[PDB]
Design a protein around this ligand. Sequence first.
Ligand code: HEM
Length: 450
Amino acid sequence: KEMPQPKTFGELKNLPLLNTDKPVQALMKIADELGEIFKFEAPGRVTRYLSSQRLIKEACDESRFDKNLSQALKFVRDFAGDGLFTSWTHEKNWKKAHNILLPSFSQQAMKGYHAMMVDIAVQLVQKWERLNADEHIEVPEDMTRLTLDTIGLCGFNYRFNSFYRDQPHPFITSMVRALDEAMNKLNPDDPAYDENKRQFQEDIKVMNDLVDKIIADRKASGEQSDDLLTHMLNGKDPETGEPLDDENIRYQIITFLIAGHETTSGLLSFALYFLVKNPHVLQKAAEEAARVLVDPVPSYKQVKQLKYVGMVLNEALRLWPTAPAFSLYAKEDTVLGGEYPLEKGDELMVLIPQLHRDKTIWGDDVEEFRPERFENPSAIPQHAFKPFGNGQRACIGQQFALHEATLVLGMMLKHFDFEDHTNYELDIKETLTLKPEGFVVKAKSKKIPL
Ligand code: HEM
């Protein structure tokens, strides 16, 4: 079959159809019109967007397709290096870091990070407890302070102290500005970008200098902490027998922050958005939080018992997966779905929000927020629900992100009632990630001490 494709406009190809800063949302609308697969061409480039479980399951066959570095990832690689997120599968440091780090990101490993996640979560709760009457909360902004600080503390035992500041720690300022410049890069040698380049280089140096110093401090003290840095200093890859070198360790630390901060904060923000818009679900979730979180701060075991909170989070990931697209290439010539010939090197994009709206899997009501879809997670067909990507190149942080989010949302629901005081209109900003831009609430404390 010929591959469906939107209208082309001479040499502009399909580009005039994507004149937006919200391309994923625009591509979803194109998928609504054209279906499970369409080609999209712009001057000098081509990809193919997939949106059905049936085709995405095939695309997820690692014998036929592997992770591609999109142009976004190639620009991020300028400061994330050969960390896990921005490496090709074949790179020696991908394989070594993957093997070394997997055990440190397992569900069992979460027991070791729990206390430090609670430390930052308590700081968030106390911030909100201390607001004066009529003050409000900037949701994504506070969730991002939380996730940055949690990844810093669990990643390398470093306190960014984001809840002490108006202006973030200089590392955060540089990382956020570097990521913003990478995304904005999507005539770059024009002199008017001279300042962009100088600033980018300056931000790289700030990031490398801090992380390289802590790595050095840690090797000097011999201190063993409950952080990922300790695991990386001590770990050996079973296959090569080699540890990660100090440069790659730095890139992994930078990577954890980049890959984890806004995905996780976006999830918490969308979950709270859906809860304030669905009062009955909010009540059920808050009832569970009150029933289960019976101690002054949560234990690891208690977080594991927040079943319905976990369902809420999965249903937020279903509707607005916060890293909404990933790229694949064809390893060899092949035919996709019995119908679409592909050449070696051809790119595919998995459009995750549209996958998560495949009516053939989810039924007719796909826009409804219904956590009960996830009552029995094992009943969901493989490759229908993919907010954390695919296979060996899936999110290594998944258990971390979900432990964090379940703990934090549980505490939020234990400690406060929330008000959508502005009747907030969902406005989804797209960068590397998705967030509900401008989402604000008021919280009324239940006055339960920590
Ligand atoms: C809800 C939160 C998160 C979501 C939705 C998410 C999603 C994803 C997705 C879709 C990928 C695959 C990207 C691709 O194929 O190009 C990925 C990869 C990755 N993520 Fe996450 N992420 C989240 C949180 C985290 C956190 C908290 C960390 C670190 C602590 C993290 C670290 C990574 C790393 C290192 C990779 C690359 C893995 C590899 O290729 O070996 N992520 N993530």
